[PDB]
């Protein structure tokens, strides 16, 4: 249980729920075929926001994960329970108007992921123990303009069967400045990119203890 509730750019937090479409309830999406897998949604309720956040292409945005909207600390319990081991992931989608695009459908491309490393540590654990900071590089080579950023943590502690994996995601609204447009990523859809049978979705992280993890979704776009 966690919420990507604010975004930091060039050292400046853009504000609670400002430019990030936040639910007030921190519960996960569990059906990967639901329209809610794109930018969260029913049976949660997601707020709108008229802020569109400017970011220079080639630089990083940092998603700031917190347990609830009311949370004002950054200790591990203020981010997400340590049982919630799994990957962190981020995607972009080029849109006409970042304040009105729903995010549902085709156009997403992956720009960051962090599953399990050589020492058996998970991406969510680096966020939980790293003050909730989830750093994400905006590619320099993409087209400028309006985008959605979908940042996600998947908790796998209850994922031995499907349904079981717990998908926590929120969409930020970006104005990307300075992109060269030299490369046009191949894209996937939400819902669509994930399936209940994926080896990183239906998985026991206990039996046997996991030594290598396949993050769901497409490969990471690189310039
Ligand atoms: C910008 O975000 C990228 C990820 O999109 C960060 O790169 C990862 O950084 C970690 C931590 O040092 C490494 O474990 C990874 O190998 C990096 N991944 C890749 C693909 O390069 C990067 O550190 C971030 N930069 C800043 C300044 O926050
Ligand atoms: Cu939870």
Author numbering: 1 to 223
Wording from the paper:
Lytic polysaccharide monooxygenases (LPMOs; also designated PMOs) are copper metalloenzymes that perform unique redox chemistry resulting in disruption of polysaccharide chains by oxygen atom insertion at the glycosidic bond. The LPMO active site is highly conserved and contains a mononuclear Cu2+ center within a “histidine brace” motif in which the copper is coordinated by the N-terminal histidine amino group, the Nδ atom of His1 and the Nε atom of a second conserved histidine in the equatorial plane. In the Cu2+ resting state, the remaining equatorial and axial positions are each occupied by a water molecule. Of particular commercial and biotechnological interest is the ability of fungal LPMOs to catalyze the oxidative cleavage of recalcitrant crystalline cellulose at the C1 and/or C4 position, thereby enhancing polysaccharide depolymerization by increasing glucan access to hydrolytic enzymes and ensuring efficient bioconversion.
LPMOs are expected to catalyze oxygen insertion under acidic conditions since they function synergistically alongside cellulases which show optimum activity at pH 3.5–5.5.65–67 Given the surprising role of a neutral His157 as a proton donor to the activated dioxygen species in our structure, we sought to probe the protonation state of His157 when exposed to acidic buffer conditions. To further support our acidic pH structure obtained by vapor exchange, a 1.5 Å X-ray dataset was collected on a crystal directly soaked in acidic buffer. Furthermore, the neutron and X-ray crystal structures of the resting state NcLPMO9D at low pH show that His157 remains singly protonated when exposed to acidic conditions. The position of His157 at pH 4.4 superimposes to its position at pH 6.0. In this position, Nδ-protonation would sterically clash with the backbone amide proton, further supporting the single Nε-protonation state observed in our neutron structure which coincides with unrestrained refinement studies of the protonation state of second-shell His residues. The barricaded active site observed in crystallo and electropositive environment of the copper potentially play a role in maintaining the observed single histidine protonation state and prevent formation of protonation pathways to the active site. However, the single protonation of His157 solely at the Nε position in our crystal structures does not rule out formation of the doubly protonated second shell histidine residue under similar acidic operando conditions where the active site would not be barricaded by crystal packing.
